[PDB]
Design a protein around this ligand. Structure first.
Ligand SMILES: [Cl-]
Ligand SMILES: [Cl-]
Ligand SMILES: [Cl-]
Lengths: 451, 451, 451
């Protein structure tokens, strides 16, 4: 049946020493709470109730889902209190899954299992067996069945021997939750309303608590400081790297590899050390990526070789292109089949034609360059006049001599040969050798300066 | 006496998800099977019998040894069957060592010990003691002596307690192997011919099986997927890094260091984080290599400093040169004693003289540059006319002003001073200040464009 | 009361295979012995007695403290002998703390605790409990109190069960040390004078030995080869990275982060993988540093973004500057608020004004550039005439067209527009569009060369 999610994002997060709300800090390039939001929507949540206490301006600036429902916890009185704020929105006939904005790696797979295990009228509980369960609340079981949670402060010498502890994540019916939440009190040392009281309520009423466990302990790890965040980052990258390796991408060093987004890949891709893939990256068959590349939101066709230390953002390479080492492709970079870009070359909103080469020390901006063109070393498209951008068009089979300047808007015909060092301001018709040059003069007797 | 090797390379390798035969995937820049081939030749194998079942085109394209003998296993019926295919080539009077194309790190040292331990008429067996020997066949021993291998499926509760397991690697006489292999049958669940049946044969005939162990467990690790390959890569690099550190190379971070080939080094070399050394690299005394360099098939003389993010392939630096940061030396790059190459500079088939400097934003291709030359920033040798490469020659003690173009073929004399921005097409005689320049004109009243 | 330190630096260090004295090899960019020297001065040592046996030229070249006292150990006869050489300099009324030039990570905190625990007339001893104390001398205790050190060679079956071992570091009164050191003998297998004999002396005289332990085992780790040095490097960097993370700097991968010096940082700094910080680095609030940057002795104001693979040494960025990717800032680089430096750009002794941009392929050396200037792509300040450096001055609101050359000394007025490809040699007055250009000529019928 229908189901909605409450994401708790209400801690102060002081141990982050941050002006950014804690659950907005990123993991693999996406905010922690966004991981949870995405899981809930993958589960098909009808609504996502985000309960926050601070930083509502910044949260609302960053999170936009058509089904996101914002719920202020006006005071920090505990997770049970936080649920009481969302409770007026639960439907009686829907399940309500409770999640944490700072436990980002919880998986859809685990949550689907939790949801299946919730007994009617009862509670599904996500528990984990720890080697050292000190501090955590222990799950009590009599003749196989769960009966309650005992906090560590109140556990007996023999109770503190249970290794199964409560993760805080749970699922239950909307109408039942409304019933339990209303009965919550706060007579205790901290004066808080603890959500775990509802376990005892359900048990005393005659209903069942069924527990399931995550596949990986990392799925239920929480983040309160940046050391915990960085450790979770490494765990997640490691898991991604293993999946890629097993699926048939060769990562030379999986510990020196980062994916912050998504990867579609062909067969026989090889990725060298210290590559960062960001956004949505698409790699064809037999793409080779060299040491140190950063590739963001780009598509790289079959058989391309990206040499070391290239930076690619929002670019398109067709099959069999070679870029780098030290190539810088910016949004709108576009290489046709078999094109080459060398070292210290920058492209921005620029198309390099089929089999065309710009091998050295070149800036191509706002340009359409034809097929079988040789952009000589030191060439620059002057696309900026101080106020507006202008376009440079080069035809098919053009030789642009080393250190040429094209002052856009300029069109260059097919078969043109532009001489070295020359400055191009007006158009050039087909097959015109064009040049703008002064012959060298030889001065006799010049004495070179001295200190 | 003489000895030959069988390398088994006959698995399907499906779990690699590859169009490249599995044993051709590289480890430290060399195909796995090539590691094994090299060990066998270091051992002095008279012949290397490579038994394959698939991918013979690609194997024969990649492997070339004058003593390599290709043996098709026409069907995948087990390692015992694979040996029966090589068996018609064994000489009676030679030992036959059996190796695996996907167990690349087996060492010459271990194999020499195995060979010494083979009893006459008997079998030398390579066994390893595992913390968890589950699945592997256990070595049985009575009063010290080996008597058989018990597969894990057929081991008793107490048998599964042996931690010594069969690695599959073994050595025995040619004529004995021919005798045993012929007696192999395939009445079993898998219908295969298992090479380990010959252990029981030798024992029942009255001959001995003597076992030895590898030094490191990694020596007998096999690769069936790219996760196993990547883990073996890290293990191997780590071992190489330790040897280099103990021999007196300072690696700032041995976990961020890769050698894919060989290194000869002097005293007091320092290598910073994330350096990749490929091919045959030779480093003099007191070479300093900065963060991120990639150096392939190059020789770097005493006291050179390679600053961060330089890429060097097939280059020669004499003593006391400085290149980088962001230097790109390509094949034929050649620096004489005390020469300097700065940032965003590229050399290809180019010699920079004794104490000569090209510090910024320069391409030198197909050039011989004299001693005490200052290649100004932005200089470019135009060596390519669209069809053929041409040569630029600069003499001793030449000042090439910033942003000069040399249109090869051009010779420049000694003591020449070339002015900034000038274009050089014809030769220049000694001490000629040469220039090609238009005086700047000052326009009054120009209004700069607007959006 | 007063206190002085003896640093033992007298080993041969042969296992380093080095021409540099062992204690001078660096850890986090500072010589090992300098770590110890700095701890001793933090403790307020009145004198630091450095006892060496070899390499005195190189030591004295590298170490300079106004309170450093050089003490030759003329022969390698043991640490007790080494102390006898420093002993003539101890004052009766001061404590003498004994340290080791090759145990670099010993902390001021631990040493302050050791100093507090020295009983009057007695010895403070630094001991550590090891999981495997094999080889080390065991601390003996009767009814809580220390009584002696038993070397491992002379320990009983039950003695070798003590896990508390002597680290060699100790503190005692000057006059007592002079008394004990004089009574040292060398009747033993090695013929050496062992400093640990003084423990028995103090005990037999009726005085106490009180022991304390380091916080971390790494604090008392010694370096005899470069593998041990590299492992200590990683341990130290890891500890620094944790402190930074907990203090609120986001390191994307703390294992790929190196600080060789000091860091002052604001709130919400983010540092990506493979960044090296050297010397004294100051980062403002919300600085973002990209993958691979190296930043040395520089100050980077609030909100700057340093894109990947930039190298910064002795630079100053004001608030809100953007440099990189592939930026190279050299000493004297100076960016005012909101300035931008793009890819393949180099600055040296150069100031880029408020909101000024040099985005591509540019060298700015010895230049003062005004506010709201656009340095076009390919621009070069020719500051070097072969003998002396010269200065280029550009005013406010100047458009320097792509591939311009400024031949210093040149002043450029405000509002100047310099055309593309032009060469500037004489000054330019305000609002002068300046240009130096030849119109392009179009040759008919030119046949391009062929192989
Ligand atoms: Cl590479
Ligand atoms: Cl460095
Ligand atoms: Cl990045």
């Amino acid at each position: 049946s229908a189901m909605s999610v409450v994401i708790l994002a209400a801690g102060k997060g002081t141990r982050m020493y941050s002006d950014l709300p804690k659950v907005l800090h990123t993991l693999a390039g996406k905010p922690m709470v966004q991981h949870v939001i995405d899981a809930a929507n993958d589960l098909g949540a009808c609504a996502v109730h985000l309960v926050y206490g601070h930083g509502g301006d910044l949260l609302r600036q960053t999170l936009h889902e058509d089904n996101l429902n914002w719920v202020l916890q006006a005071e920090q009185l505990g997770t049970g209190h936080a649920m009481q704020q969302a409770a007026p929105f639960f439907n009686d006939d829907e399940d309500i899954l409770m999640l944490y904005g700072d436990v980002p790696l919880i998986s859809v797979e685990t949550l689907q299992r939790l949801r299946a295990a919730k007994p009617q009228g009862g509670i599904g509980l996500l528990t984990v067996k720890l080697d050292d369960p000190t501090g955590y609340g222990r799950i009590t079981r009599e003749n196989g069945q769960v009966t309650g949670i005992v906090e560590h402060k109140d556990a007996s010498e023999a109770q503190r021997q249970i290794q199964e502890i409560n993760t805080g994540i749970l699922i239950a019916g909307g109408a039942d939750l409304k019933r339990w939440l209303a009965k919550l009190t706060n007579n205790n040392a901290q004066g808080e309303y603890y959500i775990t009281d509802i376990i005892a309520m359900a048990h005393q009423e005659g209903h069942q608590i069924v527990a399931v466990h995550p596949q990986r302990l990392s799925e239920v790890e929480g983040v309160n400081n940046r050391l915990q965040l960085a450790r979770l980052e490494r765990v997640y990258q490691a898991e991604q790297a293993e999946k890629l390796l097993l699926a048939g991408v060769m990562l030379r060093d999986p510990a020196r590899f980062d994916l912050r987004g998504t990867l579609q890949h062909g067969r026989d891709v090889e990725i060298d050390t210290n590559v960062i893939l960001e956004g949505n990256v698409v790699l064809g068959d037999r793409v080779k990526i060299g040491a140190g590349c950063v590739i963001k939101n780009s598509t790289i066709g079959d058989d391309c070789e990206i040499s070391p230390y290239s930076v690619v953002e929002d670019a398109q390479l067709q099959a069999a292109c070679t870029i780098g080492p030290f190539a810088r492709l910016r949004p709108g970079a576009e290489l046709l089949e078999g094109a080459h870009v060398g070292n210290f070359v920058e492209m921005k909103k620029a198309r390099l034609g089929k089999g065309s080469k710009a091998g050295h020390l070149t800036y191509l901006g706002d340009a359409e360059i034809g097929d079988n063109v040789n952009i000589g070393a030191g060439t620059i498209t002057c696309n900026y006049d101080g106020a507006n951008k202008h376009k440079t068009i080069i035809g098919d089979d053009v030789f642009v001599g080393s250190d040429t300047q094209l002052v856009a808007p300029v069109t260059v015909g097919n078969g043109v040969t532009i001489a070295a060092g020359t400055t191009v301001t007006r158009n050039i018709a087909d097959n015109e050798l064009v040049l703008s040059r002064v012959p060298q003069v030889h001065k006799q007797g010049w004495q070179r300066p001295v200190k």
